[PDB]
């Protein structure tokens, strides 16, 4: 064992020096005088009440009109974001849930929390009720996130270090991703559904391959736990948010850190990060009761989403870019535009 | 200005909101408690006594004087609790069971208790501290084979305070030792209470005729002090 660390350190710092040689110009210098986005004014259009406890996660539908949110009182509610009507309200078996996902096909919703179980609900069925279809129980840690791949494929992230690809029909995990050293907190799928990135409590982010169980790449730029990760619409870059008032941009090709979105006036820690449809705007939700708007190419604060009472927990931008939703711990969803 | 279908859409949303209101009644009339501690401490014995009288979360229900309590015991989970503890930010109280029989773990327990008390997401949350298996503690100390001063070399200098109120039938040696650990836990509790949360230690045992009643009286005090502080009275 003593003959391994000596050469592992040499390999690691070789990687480090090759990485240093790879980069030659800061992206801030490249995008130095192209265009400022200017001040951005966004205001509430609808406010969605009806959640008893606080809410942790929410996911936009693909039709850009429906969204689903999960609360600490054990409730899944599907909204009509146009007419504010409550399309569906689902009671959960476990009151502690930390994530929810909406299927791209629009007929499946999934949730899971401190029960180490990811449950699947089918919205459209011959009978007039939303019920459980499959209960994936193979983890030994709380589920931190989940994302649908198709109508029968899903990837889950657990408090247990492993990330697992599942198979709804057979109810068995096809592939297990074991590369981290702590608890994976978030995972963001690629637009082509071929390579997702996950962030953990070890300040490290890893790009994976769905076809096999191989960790393709690893990024380490932060010092605290990684709390939220998002993928750039182009599919060749991604931004993350950690518990040190900092957001960073990594490129899956250059393998560097491009910008550091932070300000001396911020002490709180990020909770959710999302991108605009064009990728020009970065939206980050903080713990100081309000979200923020960042210029993804100039690294400036160009907008604040002031209205919220408690800490924001989930943030998201709809597929067509019409609006951005925002949940928080005061149990109110606000659609901004 | 709405179609004949949107009228029935709004009607459905009203009956969703009506059912949510009915569910707000049960949610507001129940108190949620979180069990914590270590493996040696007889938490399973505690939950088995009330319940008779890779899941990762176990929930048990008990109600005394027509008010419902729900206790959530964390099941199969990893050692680290940094992340999933911020979720329990709205419980009324934490029930922190501790075993007093063996002396090696006591130092470990103080490390566990100190981190929970000083946590950022658990301020304004009071701890109903328990000391369990007290009968076995008496047996070990009266035998005298195992000393206390070897682990904590202050048992000799320290003397039982006048505030101690022991029942008849117990020698001073048991009372001197029993109240020594209780003050050790409180030594770190008083430092960071900061007029927000309070500790309510007890001296329960493995099997007890009544245990929930201690939680009832502590919970009533816990929120009575919260309301009084809220109305600028306390």
């Amino acid at each position, epitope marked *: 064992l003593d003959q391994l660390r000596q050469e592992a350190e040499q390999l690691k710092n070789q990687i480090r020096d090759a990485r240093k040689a790879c980069a030659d110009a800061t992206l801030s210098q490249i995008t130095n005088n192209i265009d400022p986005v200017g001040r951005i004014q966004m205001r509430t259009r609808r406010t969605l009440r009806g959640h008893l406890a606080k809410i942790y996660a929410m996911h936009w539908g693909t039709d850009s*009109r*429906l969204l689903v949110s999960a609360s600490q009182d054990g409730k899944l509610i599907i909204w*009509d974001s*146009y*007419t504010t*009507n409550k*399309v*569906h309200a689902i009671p959960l078996r476990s009151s502690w849930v930390m994530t929810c996902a909406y299927a791209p096909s629009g007929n499946y919703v999934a949730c899971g929390g401190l029960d180490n179980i990811c449950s699947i609900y089918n919205l459209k069925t*011959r*009978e*007039g*009720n939303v019920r459980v279809s499959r209960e994936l129980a193979g983890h030994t840690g709380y589920l931190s996130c989940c994302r649908f791949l198709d109508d029968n494929q899903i990837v889950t992230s657990s408090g247990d270090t492993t990330c697992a690809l599942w198979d709804i029909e057979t109810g068995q995990q096809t592939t297990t991703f074991t590369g981290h050293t702590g608890d994976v907190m978030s995972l963001s799928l690629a637009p082509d559904t071929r390579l997702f990135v996950s962030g953990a409590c070890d300040a490290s982010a890893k790009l994976w391959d769905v076809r096999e169980g191989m960790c393709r790449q690893t990024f380490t730029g932060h010092e605290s736990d990684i709390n939220a990760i998002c993928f750039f619409p182009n599919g060749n870059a991604f931004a993350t948010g950690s518990d040190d008032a900092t957001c960073r941009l990594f490129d899956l090709r250059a393998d560097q850190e491009l910008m550091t979105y932070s300000h001396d006036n911020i002490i709180c820690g990020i909770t959710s990060v999302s991108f605009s449809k064009s990728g020009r705007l970065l939206l980050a939700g903080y713990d100081d009761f309000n979200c923020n708007v960042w210029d993804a190419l100039k690294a400036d604060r160009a907008g604040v989403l002031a209205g919220h009472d408690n800490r924001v927990s989930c943030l998201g931008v709809t597929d067509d870019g019409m609006a951005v939703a925002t949940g928080s711990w005061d149990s109110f969803l606000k659609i901004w535009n | *200005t709405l*179609s*004949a*279908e*949107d*009228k*029935a*859409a709004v*009607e*459905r949303s*009203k*009956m969703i909101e009506k059912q949510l209101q009915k569910d707000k009644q049960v949610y507001r009339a129940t108190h949620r408690l979180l069990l914590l501690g270590a493996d040696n401490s007889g938490k399973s014995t505690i939950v088995k006594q009330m319940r008779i009288y890779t899941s990762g979360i176990f929930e048990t229900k008990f109600q005394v004087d027509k008010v419902n309590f729900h206790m959530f015991d964390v099941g199969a989970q990893r050692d680290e609790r940094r992340k999933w503890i911020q979720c329990f930010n709205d419980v009324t109280a934490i029930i922190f069971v501790v075993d007093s029989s063996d002396y090696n773990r006591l130092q470990e327990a103080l490390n566990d208790f100190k981190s929970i008390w000083n946590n950022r997401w658990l301020r304004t949350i009071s701890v109903i501290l328990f000391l369990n298996k007290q009968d076995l503690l008496a047996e070990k100390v009266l035998a005298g084979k195992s000393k206390i001063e070897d682990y904590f070399p202050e048992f000799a200098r320290y003397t039982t305070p006048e505030d101690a109120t022991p029942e008849p039938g117990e020698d001073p040696r048991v009372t001197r030792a029993k109240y020594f650990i209780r003050d050790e836990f409180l030594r770190i509790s008083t430092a960071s209470g900061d007029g927000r949360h309070y500790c309510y230690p007890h001296f329960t045992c493995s099997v007890d005729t009544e245990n929930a009643r201690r939680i009832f009286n502590d919970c009533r005090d816990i929120i009575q002090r919260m309301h009084l502080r809220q109305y600028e009275l306390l």
Partner: single-chain antibody
Amino acid sequence: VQLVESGGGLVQPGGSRKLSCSASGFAFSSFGMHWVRQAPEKGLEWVAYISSGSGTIYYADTVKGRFTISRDDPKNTLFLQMTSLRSEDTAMYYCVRSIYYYGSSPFDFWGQGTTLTVSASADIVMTQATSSVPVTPGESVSICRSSKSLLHSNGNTYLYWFLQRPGQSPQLLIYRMSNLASGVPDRFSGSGSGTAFTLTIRLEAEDVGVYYCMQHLEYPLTFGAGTKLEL
């Protein structure tokens, strides 16, 4: 999802009768319920409507005030009480379930009447152009009767296309003129111009039967005259 209808029988011209539609296999408490009449030798017409939870109730102006529609969720049964029957009310009755929310498909399940034979304005009219068109397997058949623009401000159309197999209950084919109902093959593409509509089909051997439409924009639900396809 299977609901049966009970009642019927020989009745006197002036008496009373009770009609029941007992639901089973679905969450009956979250479904609006309608009643639709179908004359022995004519088209189908609306009768009544009771919302889920009995919040709102409408009636047909033809027999308003002589009929009552009531629910029973505990027992999952629907009732219709008829008083002072006349010769016009002689037909077969269908209880049609429908649920209304974003993306729903109302009027999807009907259920056939079992021995349901009985004895003796500013609306929208949907008199279809034809009543019979020759059909052979291989060629499409299609034929718009709207007295008002069936296009609300939201963006929908509110035209439902039903098909009547010869000898049993109707079925839903297309709702809102562009949405194909579940459980039926490719029978329509999506085409309409606010006031003119058509239903283009390859014809198989089961398509024979009446083929009429409906309106849902305003409170009265007026059906089409009826188009038939024969081999």
